[PDB]
Amino acid sequence: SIVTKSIVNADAEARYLSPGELDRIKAFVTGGAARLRIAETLTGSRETIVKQAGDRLFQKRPDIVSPGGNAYGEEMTATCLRDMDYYLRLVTYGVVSGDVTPIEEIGLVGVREMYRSLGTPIEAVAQSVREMKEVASGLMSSDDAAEASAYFDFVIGKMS
Amino acid sequence: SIVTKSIVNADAEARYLSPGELDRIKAFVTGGAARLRIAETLTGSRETIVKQAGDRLFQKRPDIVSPGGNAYGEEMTATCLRDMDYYLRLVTYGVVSGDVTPIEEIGLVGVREMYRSLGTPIEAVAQSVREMKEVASGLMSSDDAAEASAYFDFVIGKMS
Amino acid sequence: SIVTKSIVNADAEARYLSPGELDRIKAFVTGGAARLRIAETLTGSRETIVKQAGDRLFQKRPDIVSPGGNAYGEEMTATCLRDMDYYLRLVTYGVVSGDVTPIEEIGLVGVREMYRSLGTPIEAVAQSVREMKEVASGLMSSDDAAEASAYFDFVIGKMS
Amino acid sequence: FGEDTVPYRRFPTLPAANFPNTERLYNKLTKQDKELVVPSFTPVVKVG
Amino acid sequence: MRMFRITACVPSQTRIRTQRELQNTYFTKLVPYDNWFREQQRIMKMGGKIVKVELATGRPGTNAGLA
Amino acid sequence: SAIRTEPEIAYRSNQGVTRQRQQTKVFKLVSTYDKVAVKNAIRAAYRQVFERDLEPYIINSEFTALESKLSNNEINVKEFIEGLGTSELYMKEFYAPYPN
Amino acid sequence: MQDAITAVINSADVQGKYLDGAAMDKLKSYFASGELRVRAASVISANAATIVKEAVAKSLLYSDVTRPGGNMYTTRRYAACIRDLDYYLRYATYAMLAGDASILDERVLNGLKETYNSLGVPISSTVQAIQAIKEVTASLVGADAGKEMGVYLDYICSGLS
Amino acid sequence: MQDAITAVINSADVQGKYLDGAAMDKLKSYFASGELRVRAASVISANAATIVKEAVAKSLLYSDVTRPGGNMYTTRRYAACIRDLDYYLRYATYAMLAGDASILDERVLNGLKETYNSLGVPISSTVQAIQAIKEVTASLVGADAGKEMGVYLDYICSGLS
Amino acid sequence: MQDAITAVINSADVQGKYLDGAAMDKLKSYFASGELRVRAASVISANAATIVKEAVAKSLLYSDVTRPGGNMYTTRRYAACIRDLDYYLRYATYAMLAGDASILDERVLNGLKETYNSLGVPISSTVQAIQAIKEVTASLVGADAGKEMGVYLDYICSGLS
Amino acid sequence: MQDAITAVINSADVQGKYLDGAAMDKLKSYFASGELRVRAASVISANAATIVKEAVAKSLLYSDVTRPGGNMYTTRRYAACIRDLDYYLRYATYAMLAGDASILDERVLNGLKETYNSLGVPISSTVQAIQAIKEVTASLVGADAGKEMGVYLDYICSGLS
Amino acid sequence: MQDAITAVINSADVQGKYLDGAAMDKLKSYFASGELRVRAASVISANAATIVKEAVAKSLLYSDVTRPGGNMYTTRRYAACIRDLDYYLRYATYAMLAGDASILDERVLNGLKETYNSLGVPISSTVQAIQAIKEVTASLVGADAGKEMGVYLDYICSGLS
Ligand SMILES: *[C@@H](C)[C@H]1/C(=C/c2[nH]c(/C=C3N=C(/C=C4\NC(=O)C(CC)=C4C)C(C)=C\3CCC(=O)O)c(CCC(=O)O)c2C)NC(=O)[C@@H]1C
Ligand SMILES: *[C@@H](C)[C@H]1/C(=C/c2[nH]c(/C=C3N=C(/C=C4\NC(=O)C(CC)=C4C)C(C)=C\3CCC(=O)O)c(CCC(=O)O)c2C)NC(=O)[C@@H]1C
Ligand SMILES: *[C@H](C)[C@H]1/C(=C/c2[nH]c(/C=C3N=C(/C=C4\NC(=O)C(CC)=C4C)C(C)=C\3CCC(=O)O)c(CCC(=O)O)c2C)NC(=O)[C@@H]1C
Ligand SMILES: *[C@H](C)[C@H]1/C(=C/c2[nH]c(/C=C3N=C(/C=C4\NC(=O)C(CC)=C4C)C(C)=C\3CCC(=O)O)c(CCC(=O)O)c2C)NC(=O)[C@@H]1C
Ligand SMILES: *[C@H](C)[C@H]1/C(=C/c2[nH]c(/C=C3N=C(/C=C4\NC(=O)C(CC)=C4C)C(C)=C\3CCC(=O)O)c(CCC(=O)O)c2C)NC(=O)[C@@H]1C
Ligand SMILES: *[C@H](C)[C@H]1/C(=C/c2[nH]c(/C=C3N=C(/C=C4\NC(=O)C(CC)=C4C)C(C)=C\3CCC(=O)O)c(CCC(=O)O)c2C)NC(=O)[C@@H]1C
Ligand SMILES: *[C@H](C)[C@H]1/C(=C/c2[nH]c(/C=C3N=C(/C=C4\NC(=O)C(CC)=C4C)C(C)=C\3CCC(=O)O)c(CCC(=O)O)c2C)NC(=O)[C@@H]1C
Ligand SMILES: *[C@H](C)[C@H]1/C(=C/c2[nH]c(/C=C3N=C(/C=C4\NC(=O)C(CC)=C4C)C(C)=C\3CCC(=O)O)c(CCC(=O)O)c2C)NC(=O)[C@@H]1C
Ligand SMILES: *[C@H](C)[C@H]1/C(=C/c2[nH]c(/C=C3N=C(/C=C4\NC(=O)C(CC)=C4C)C(C)=C\3CCC(=O)O)c(CCC(=O)O)c2C)NC(=O)[C@@H]1C
Ligand SMILES: *[C@H](C)[C@H]1/C(=C/c2[nH]c(/C=C3N=C(/C=C4\NC(=O)C(CC)=C4C)C(C)=C\3CCC(=O)O)c(CCC(=O)O)c2C)NC(=O)[C@@H]1C
């Protein structure tokens, strides 16, 4: 939440919210309608969004399912897709909340540790998230496309 | 070098390189003939060892040489052979020196950053170094095999 | 012990022990046989060492056992011999451990303060340890003489 | 610690109760509990 | 943030430290502006001689935009 | 005196101040030439300041600039410690979730 | 800590689901609160010292609390009380602008009763101080904003007691 | 903290007696086991990450702990659990190399149960993960070194339970 | 901390009155005692080391505590006892010179019980050493200065108990 | 820091090629010198303080440096000289054992000249003390090891100059 | 409470398994020690009053505790010490007979520390009395059988520490 983000930033200096923080809270509370609207528009296409993104990524980097690969097996393909689904839920959470704090607290912090422990390629998972973002931008409205692509972009850059 | 490591430790403790380290330096300098001989052995058989190591690594992880993977192209495979050559030369340096300081100062510090910037599966690189260690152990005789294996699995653990 | 010191250093660095430290532990284990022999020799010659050490010390410094001295009475002389026995036991501990750590941790931290509180001549105690070293070197082999004299000199320097 | 030493856990003798307070602080792992080991020192004499 | 870089020689006036000490006896550090006054007070009270100081980062007399 | 049974022996082996007072290391960045020593000191500083290794608590290391400055010797270990203290992670971990 | 928005987010996430209709209506309610909360926060930031000043002048000021024997005696203890009021007001503003008391009970109630008891603090006098804070804030923020601010301050008082 | 040699020395010191035959025999036993312990420690240092990875995969994946609701959910909690297992492995290796469990007792066990109860993490799941690490380590190191590591790991589990 | 004079000051100021005849009488009594207090403090400072040495000789030496395994074993610990007895004597001198034993329970007894319990210090042995110091200092300084010093040292002992 | 071994390895690595006949020759030459190096280092470690003793006695004692007005006046400055000579002897021993005078550059000469100029240390007297140390060490450890230590001591004195 | 047999049974029952060879071996060891335990228990029961008599005589009599104002003054309090020492001896005999020192924890050490701290009972003096009891009972029942009694009295002393 941008609310809690600015609250923590102000408390760091032990003072009330600045005019900039209060103005951004104004904008977020006003645009919460469009934010929740993009929330439904992305939460309704979850199956198709993940299916298209994973399918595209599979020929983007065939090594993921190639023999001796990270997700060569059917089970590991499904597991990679399930990670795609988790990250899409996290981006939905972040877009609704107006801040990347849910993303950070759920599925970004220590993720490099996660994927070095499991051997999965961080660049490949970033490309998967990019495919998710591309399909979402295609299947949603233009302004909503940019709004959701902001948080898709954040997660892609941070994880990658 | 073992002498350099002992000097660093003695300086850190403000000491005079106690007999517990002086005798170790004496033993190393006396037995240096075997270390040198292992050095020429590895230098002579570097090409073959690298070749079977690459063969075993590709057998275990064919995806890396696949077009999706990093090693595909007949020049990425050449670059893997080149990196294995560097690592073998570094291990020879470490064996002749007596400690892992040249190893870590040449090719272990920031290796994760390098392989992330190159997209390389560092765990696959560790597997390749394991194959190199097994080939070298087969090529050399027992105690020499363990002496080289100390540096080999040190590099393996650091890479992992 | 070298084992405990290496473990402490490795834990402070939050890492596993390096090959150099492991080789040091191997050398320590190998020398454990000779160290045990020296410790057994001292323990067997325990009462002898204290007896001739005390006699020679009193010959060199008769005032300490003279009337008005810290060790005039028979009980006071027995207390000196008790302290000498303490330090010989500590030296045997150090010889077994391969390091001066047990000696310093048991009877070398605040030794100056303790003997100043007791009114004991610290230089006289140093001379006592020197006499003990002479007795042990006399009744011990040449190389083992130097090995134990290292710890004896450590205690003497700590006294001074 | 000076200008070159990384700070390390200390074992001070003084002042009073500083050793027990540091002991209670350092004998517990991170996030072990939310209680306050030393919320404040109850003064023996209250001014006014 | 308008940092300061200073070279100061701080002798030892109470203890004879037996390990290496140039790294804290003659050093050039980068000091933030806010902490520069406190750091200099501490150094002088510790007895060091401030050989040199210069505003490495920032611009002099900036009436605005100094962070 | 007495027999000193095993319970008393074990108890008296750890009697006064814990041995951790001496069984520790102090990281003094004597020289910045030793890059391995600099890295070790930096990691130890992270451990002391944050009580933990900061692998599972960071997206990526934000203290990379401080590490570079320390390795270049333009700031001292005290400055590195101050930078670690004045960090978003420190206020997240020990300042945000606790009273003053 | 958390607010209403993060509460709905993590309530969904713990079950590992997207935002259902209940979460949507909760978020809509919080957004509707919205500008009212931000305006109350802005006015409080305006007259930050004011509410504490007249709250003290109403409840604590000119009494045995500020007299000898009372905990407010001496300028040091007086300024400590003022600092405590400033803490309470900033946390109240934060909790108001967030929508949850997690910030308070993570930054206030943790050990606060025991520390005040160790200092021999008057819990009743403190509670009266927060009350006067509540009325002074209400008189400057309005009816509903003042009501929610008073609710948060009352939670603070309950935790303190 | 104390290895076998230091433990024997401290015990003899507390009795105020020299190193008798029993102490000498114990020290000789440790010296005999030294080469084994060194090789096992080297192997575990080489394969530390792989051991934890395999143990987690074969013990703590695709279950409720990994799923939301389980305490291993999210990258943060999963990394915390992985780091806990890495700590367990490294400290067990330290105890094996030193021939004594005092390091585990003073650096691991103390407050471990308290923190686990505070954070609600599954002690049973942690115990099972330690088990799996035990089998992986035994397989990598051998039989006798495997048992030496396993006794300390089971001691960790017993303390944590 | 509080002395004989600031004790009267705070006693008056809690009710906020001025210094009446009784306060002046108390201050004059303290000023009369000041000569004895200063002389005793100077003598005690001169003979501090010898006093603790004699008390240790007649209360702790040649016993189980000093024997191997005992808490007074391990010369670092003996020096720790020497320093602790020095601290007790010096702060007792502070309290005697002040006329009020508030520094004793502020800068001395604060946390002492838990400190000794954690470290396994023999509390009764420390108390006995304190009465040994009390007797030695009373003999050294006289009957009245010894009276006051014994009062404060026994206050410390009661705090330990 | 680099020894002869590290220098050879760096010379090979800059070209990025495996070790060759010249590298083996250099390594075996250093190995041959290692016996003398270790013996000289051990003897210097055994009697390091004595060497500083005769060096200071025959170089600076009973002179204007030690007299009032000289920088060796006062016990603090005398101990500073003793510790500095210990530094020089220890680092010369380090350089002799390593075979390369790089430890002197990066651990001794790094800012030593500027520090001496700022603090007023007399460089000429320091050089004379260094020469005295070299003479004593040569006479104490023989001819070949004497020259080996002397070359590094002359390196340090030249760097000071 | 618990004994050797109950300890083995609970050790088996915690994992729910039956009794394997190790458990039967431990039970056989306890049965072997049973004759010694019964011998020592009967002897201590016969000579219980005597043992406390000489323990008090050689540990507490003619001392500050017994002197007027001492905690062992006021004959009711002396009888209380006699009864408490008898309690310690009886429950130590219980622990020796059982082979497990859990009856001491759940029937002697339960609240005894708080009891003595609230009552002003010298803990170190009581520990010395228990040590004297240990010496007397060891001399009465021999070194081997006295070893167990010493172990359990030492457990009581450590718990009371
Ligand atoms: C003659 C050899 C020298 C000498 C010795 C001396 N010592 C004492 C008394 C004590 N010595 C100790 C020492 C130790 N306790 C420890 O725990 C350690 C090792 C960890 C040491 C070294 C202690 C504690 C005492 C006093 C308590 C006790 O004895 O139990 C005496 C008698 C002093 C007196 O007046 O009682 C003497 C004579 N004194 C000299 O002058 C010689 C140089
Ligand atoms: C001769 C008159 C009779 C006698 C007396 C006797 N008593 C003791 C020892 C002690 N007497 C006491 C008594 C008390 N302590 C108290 O607090 C009270 C309240 C007034 C009383 C009555 C104590 C505590 C002791 C022992 C401890 C100490 O003395 O400090 C003895 C000595 C016995 C011994 O073994 O020491 C004697 C001789 N004994 C007789 O046979 C006469 C009938
Ligand atoms: C797919 C785009 C990429 C990929 C994925 C992949 N992941 C795994 C296994 C796991 N991934 C996770 C990650 C999470 N679980 C969570 O609950 C969250 C927090 C919200 C995250 C980030 C975990 C925990 C696992 C293992 C346990 C589990 O599945 O719950 C695999 C298989 C690993 C295996 O060896 O079994 C794969 C393949 N792989 C790719 O190559 C893509 C780029
Ligand atoms: C091979 C099995 C694995 C792999 C390796 C790989 N590396 C590169 C490219 C480079 N490697 C380096 C640097 C080093 N390699 C070393 O061994 C060391 C010695 C210390 C160093 C410093 C560099 C700088 C490059 C690129 C530039 C250069 O080659 O000089 C490649 C090619 C990557 C590309 O796209 O060009 C490869 C394939 N990659 C895998 O996937 C395998 C697991
Ligand atoms: C002595 C024969 C000459 C002399 C010396 C002298 N030096 C100082 C003070 C310092 N000397 C150093 C030098 C070093 N410290 C190191 O760690 C090393 C490298 C490992 C070196 C070379 C330093 C740093 C100081 C200052 C800090 C300190 O002492 O810790 C003094 C004292 C100066 C003063 O008053 O502060 C003196 C006297 N002086 C002579 O006249 C001789 C020729
Ligand atoms: C000595 C006769 C008895 C005894 C004491 C003992 N104490 C310690 C260690 C400490 N003592 C203190 C106490 C204080 N510090 C203060 O500032 C105050 C105010 C006066 C007090 C009372 C502390 C804090 C410590 C620990 C810190 C430190 O020692 O620096 C020891 C040694 C502990 C160790 O392990 O070194 C001892 C021996 N023990 C006995 O057996 C005597 C009865
Ligand atoms: C890369 C394009 C070229 C290159 C780079 C290179 N740089 C260094 C070392 C340092 N670089 C810096 C610079 C910075 N540190 C910071 O924190 C920032 C501000 C945010 C900057 C600009 C510093 C301070 C160092 C030294 C300390 C450190 O490690 O950071 C090296 C290594 C030098 C060495 O010998 O260690 C290299 C290789 N090298 C090339 O060849 C490229 C042209
Ligand atoms: C008069 C010289 C100046 C002045 C005074 C003034 N003060 C107040 C109100 C208060 N003053 C205090 C101060 C103290 N109380 C203490 O206990 C202590 C130490 C013993 C101090 C310093 C307090 C607490 C109050 C509040 C009322 C009370 O005491 O209960 C006022 C009135 C403020 C109001 O709003 O009522 C005034 C006017 N004002 C000047 O301009 C003079 C320079
Ligand atoms: C004033 C509103 C009432 C009062 C209280 C009072 N408080 C103190 C001292 C302290 N108060 C706190 C409390 C907090 N600090 C925090 O950071 C937080 C949350 C942000 C809280 C709630 C603390 C820690 C102290 C002590 C440290 C300090 O001075 O900052 C005093 C003085 C006590 C003393 O012994 O001096 C008083 C009197 N008393 C009243 O009568 C008012 C109703
Ligand atoms: C993994 C097998 C299981 C698991 C682990 C888990 N632990 C935590 C948090 C903590 N664990 C510890 C324990 C230690 N830290 C140490 O340094 C040592 C010393 C040897 C121990 C024993 C601590 C102190 C914490 C809290 C601090 C921290 O940042 O880790 C978590 C996260 C809890 C949270 O709320 O963040 C997790 C997930 N969880 C499982 O479900 C596995 C069975």
mmCIF file with all atom_site columns, C-alpha atoms and ligand atoms in Angstrom, chain D residues 29-31, chain F residues 52 57, chain H residues 60 65 71-72 76-77 80-85 87-88 91 107-108 112 115-116 119 121-122 125-126 129, ligand 10:
data_model
loop_
_atom_site.group_PDB
_atom_site.id
_atom_site.type_symbol
_atom_site.label_atom_id
_atom_site.label_alt_id
_atom_site.label_comp_id
_atom_site.label_asym_id
_atom_site.label_entity_id
_atom_site.label_seq_id
_atom_site.pdbx_PDB_ins_code
_atom_site.Cartn_x
_atom_site.Cartn_y
_atom_site.Cartn_z
_atom_site.occupancy
_atom_site.B_iso_or_equiv
_atom_site.pdbx_formal_charge
_atom_site.auth_seq_id
_atom_site.auth_comp_id
_atom_site.auth_asym_id
_atom_site.auth_atom_id
_atom_site.pdbx_PDB_model_num
ATOM   1  C CA  . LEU D 1 29  ? 17.991 -14.768 18.489 1.00 0.00 ? 29  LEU D CA  1
ATOM   2  C CA  . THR D 1 30  ? 16.540 -12.171 16.145 1.00 0.00 ? 30  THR D CA  1
ATOM   3  C CA  . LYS D 1 31  ? 12.774 -11.684 16.447 1.00 0.00 ? 31  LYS D CA  1
ATOM   4  C CA  . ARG F 2 52  ? 21.837 -11.902 10.059 1.00 0.00 ? 52  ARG F CA  1
ATOM   5  C CA  . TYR F 2 57  ? 15.876 -9.997  3.225  1.00 0.00 ? 57  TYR F CA  1
ATOM   6  C CA  . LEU H 3 60  ? 9.605  -29.965 2.290  1.00 0.00 ? 60  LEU H CA  1
ATOM   7  C CA  . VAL H 3 65  ? 4.107  -25.620 4.249  1.00 0.00 ? 65  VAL H CA  1
ATOM   8  C CA  . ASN H 3 71  ? 4.915  -20.979 7.019  1.00 0.00 ? 71  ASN H CA  1
ATOM   9  C CA  . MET H 3 72  ? 7.230  -21.503 4.018  1.00 0.00 ? 72  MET H CA  1
ATOM   10 C CA  . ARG H 3 76  ? 10.854 -14.296 2.196  1.00 0.00 ? 76  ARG H CA  1
ATOM   11 C CA  . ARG H 3 77  ? 9.666  -17.202 4.338  1.00 0.00 ? 77  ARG H CA  1
ATOM   12 C CA  . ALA H 3 80  ? 14.255 -17.928 5.860  1.00 0.00 ? 80  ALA H CA  1
ATOM   13 C CA  . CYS H 3 81  ? 13.558 -21.669 6.010  1.00 0.00 ? 81  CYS H CA  1
ATOM   14 C CA  . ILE H 3 82  ? 16.374 -22.445 3.566  1.00 0.00 ? 82  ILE H CA  1
ATOM   15 C CA  . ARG H 3 83  ? 18.759 -20.295 5.603  1.00 0.00 ? 83  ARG H CA  1
ATOM   16 C CA  . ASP H 3 84  ? 17.648 -22.075 8.777  1.00 0.00 ? 84  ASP H CA  1
ATOM   17 C CA  . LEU H 3 85  ? 18.469 -25.422 7.181  1.00 0.00 ? 85  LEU H CA  1
ATOM   18 C CA  . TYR H 3 87  ? 22.561 -22.891 9.508  1.00 0.00 ? 87  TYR H CA  1
ATOM   19 C CA  . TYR H 3 88  ? 21.671 -26.336 10.838 1.00 0.00 ? 88  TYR H CA  1
ATOM   20 C CA  . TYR H 3 91  ? 26.658 -25.846 12.692 1.00 0.00 ? 91  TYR H CA  1
ATOM   21 C CA  . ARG H 3 107 ? 24.898 -21.008 19.137 1.00 0.00 ? 107 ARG H CA  1
ATOM   22 C CA  . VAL H 3 108 ? 21.833 -22.918 17.914 1.00 0.00 ? 108 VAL H CA  1
ATOM   23 C CA  . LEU H 3 112 ? 15.517 -21.682 18.990 1.00 0.00 ? 112 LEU H CA  1
ATOM   24 C CA  . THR H 3 115 ? 11.685 -18.060 18.386 1.00 0.00 ? 115 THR H CA  1
ATOM   25 C CA  . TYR H 3 116 ? 9.991  -20.932 16.558 1.00 0.00 ? 116 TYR H CA  1
ATOM   26 C CA  . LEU H 3 119 ? 6.953  -17.104 14.658 1.00 0.00 ? 119 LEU H CA  1
ATOM   27 C CA  . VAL H 3 121 ? 6.915  -22.114 12.239 1.00 0.00 ? 121 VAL H CA  1
ATOM   28 C CA  . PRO H 3 122 ? 6.412  -25.905 12.069 1.00 0.00 ? 122 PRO H CA  1
ATOM   29 C CA  . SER H 3 125 ? 8.446  -29.850 9.545  1.00 0.00 ? 125 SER H CA  1
ATOM   30 C CA  . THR H 3 126 ? 11.838 -28.514 10.631 1.00 0.00 ? 126 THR H CA  1
ATOM   31 C CA  . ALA H 3 129 ? 13.842 -31.396 7.045  1.00 0.00 ? 129 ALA H CA  1
HETATM 32 C C1  . LIG L 4 .   ? 12.697 -24.481 7.506  1.00 0.00 ? 10  LIG L C1  1
HETATM 33 C C2  . LIG L 4 .   ? 13.266 -25.879 7.582  1.00 0.00 ? 10  LIG L C2  1
HETATM 34 C C3  . LIG L 4 .   ? 11.458 -24.279 8.393  1.00 0.00 ? 10  LIG L C3  1
HETATM 35 C C4  . LIG L 4 .   ? 11.138 -22.818 8.550  1.00 0.00 ? 10  LIG L C4  1
HETATM 36 C C5  . LIG L 4 .   ? 12.039 -21.846 8.884  1.00 0.00 ? 10  LIG L C5  1
HETATM 37 C C6  . LIG L 4 .   ? 11.905 -20.482 9.196  1.00 0.00 ? 10  LIG L C6  1
HETATM 38 N N1  . LIG L 4 .   ? 12.576 -19.847 10.214 1.00 0.00 ? 10  LIG L N1  1
HETATM 39 C C7  . LIG L 4 .   ? 12.223 -18.521 10.250 1.00 0.00 ? 10  LIG L C7  1
HETATM 40 C C8  . LIG L 4 .   ? 12.748 -17.558 11.121 1.00 0.00 ? 10  LIG L C8  1
HETATM 41 C C9  . LIG L 4 .   ? 13.738 -17.690 12.064 1.00 0.00 ? 10  LIG L C9  1
HETATM 42 N N2  . LIG L 4 .   ? 14.438 -18.854 12.334 1.00 0.00 ? 10  LIG L N2  1
HETATM 43 C C10 . LIG L 4 .   ? 15.343 -18.532 13.295 1.00 0.00 ? 10  LIG L C10 1
HETATM 44 C C11 . LIG L 4 .   ? 16.285 -19.419 13.835 1.00 0.00 ? 10  LIG L C11 1
HETATM 45 C C12 . LIG L 4 .   ? 17.638 -19.239 13.908 1.00 0.00 ? 10  LIG L C12 1
HETATM 46 N N3  . LIG L 4 .   ? 18.336 -18.144 13.459 1.00 0.00 ? 10  LIG L N3  1
HETATM 47 C C13 . LIG L 4 .   ? 19.676 -18.283 13.710 1.00 0.00 ? 10  LIG L C13 1
HETATM 48 O O1  . LIG L 4 .   ? 20.544 -17.462 13.417 1.00 0.00 ? 10  LIG L O1  1
HETATM 49 C C14 . LIG L 4 .   ? 19.852 -19.584 14.380 1.00 0.00 ? 10  LIG L C14 1
HETATM 50 C C15 . LIG L 4 .   ? 21.059 -19.870 15.229 1.00 0.00 ? 10  LIG L C15 1
HETATM 51 C C16 . LIG L 4 .   ? 21.608 -21.260 15.015 1.00 0.00 ? 10  LIG L C16 1
HETATM 52 C C17 . LIG L 4 .   ? 18.606 -20.150 14.485 1.00 0.00 ? 10  LIG L C17 1
HETATM 53 C C18 . LIG L 4 .   ? 18.258 -21.484 15.074 1.00 0.00 ? 10  LIG L C18 1
HETATM 54 C C19 . LIG L 4 .   ? 15.230 -17.133 13.674 1.00 0.00 ? 10  LIG L C19 1
HETATM 55 C C20 . LIG L 4 .   ? 16.060 -16.439 14.713 1.00 0.00 ? 10  LIG L C20 1
HETATM 56 C C21 . LIG L 4 .   ? 14.227 -16.607 12.901 1.00 0.00 ? 10  LIG L C21 1
HETATM 57 C C22 . LIG L 4 .   ? 13.733 -15.186 12.896 1.00 0.00 ? 10  LIG L C22 1
HETATM 58 C C23 . LIG L 4 .   ? 14.713 -14.224 12.248 1.00 0.00 ? 10  LIG L C23 1
HETATM 59 C C24 . LIG L 4 .   ? 14.878 -14.436 10.772 1.00 0.00 ? 10  LIG L C24 1
HETATM 60 O O2  . LIG L 4 .   ? 14.940 -13.321 10.095 1.00 0.00 ? 10  LIG L O2  1
HETATM 61 O O3  . LIG L 4 .   ? 14.951 -15.531 10.258 1.00 0.00 ? 10  LIG L O3  1
HETATM 62 C C25 . LIG L 4 .   ? 11.286 -18.303 9.214  1.00 0.00 ? 10  LIG L C25 1
HETATM 63 C C26 . LIG L 4 .   ? 10.620 -17.001 8.865  1.00 0.00 ? 10  LIG L C26 1
HETATM 64 C C27 . LIG L 4 .   ? 9.698  -16.503 9.960  1.00 0.00 ? 10  LIG L C27 1
HETATM 65 C C28 . LIG L 4 .   ? 9.149  -15.132 9.695  1.00 0.00 ? 10  LIG L C28 1
HETATM 66 O O4  . LIG L 4 .   ? 8.105  -14.732 10.167 1.00 0.00 ? 10  LIG L O4  1
HETATM 67 O O5  . LIG L 4 .   ? 9.907  -14.416 8.908  1.00 0.00 ? 10  LIG L O5  1
HETATM 68 C C29 . LIG L 4 .   ? 11.095 -19.518 8.557  1.00 0.00 ? 10  LIG L C29 1
HETATM 69 C C30 . LIG L 4 .   ? 10.208 -19.743 7.369  1.00 0.00 ? 10  LIG L C30 1
HETATM 70 N N4  . LIG L 4 .   ? 9.807  -22.630 8.283  1.00 0.00 ? 10  LIG L N4  1
HETATM 71 C C31 . LIG L 4 .   ? 9.157  -23.773 7.891  1.00 0.00 ? 10  LIG L C31 1
HETATM 72 O O6  . LIG L 4 .   ? 7.960  -23.852 7.632  1.00 0.00 ? 10  LIG L O6  1
HETATM 73 C C32 . LIG L 4 .   ? 10.168 -24.899 7.831  1.00 0.00 ? 10  LIG L C32 1
HETATM 74 C C33 . LIG L 4 .   ? 9.697  -26.159 8.549  1.00 0.00 ? 10  LIG L C33 1
#
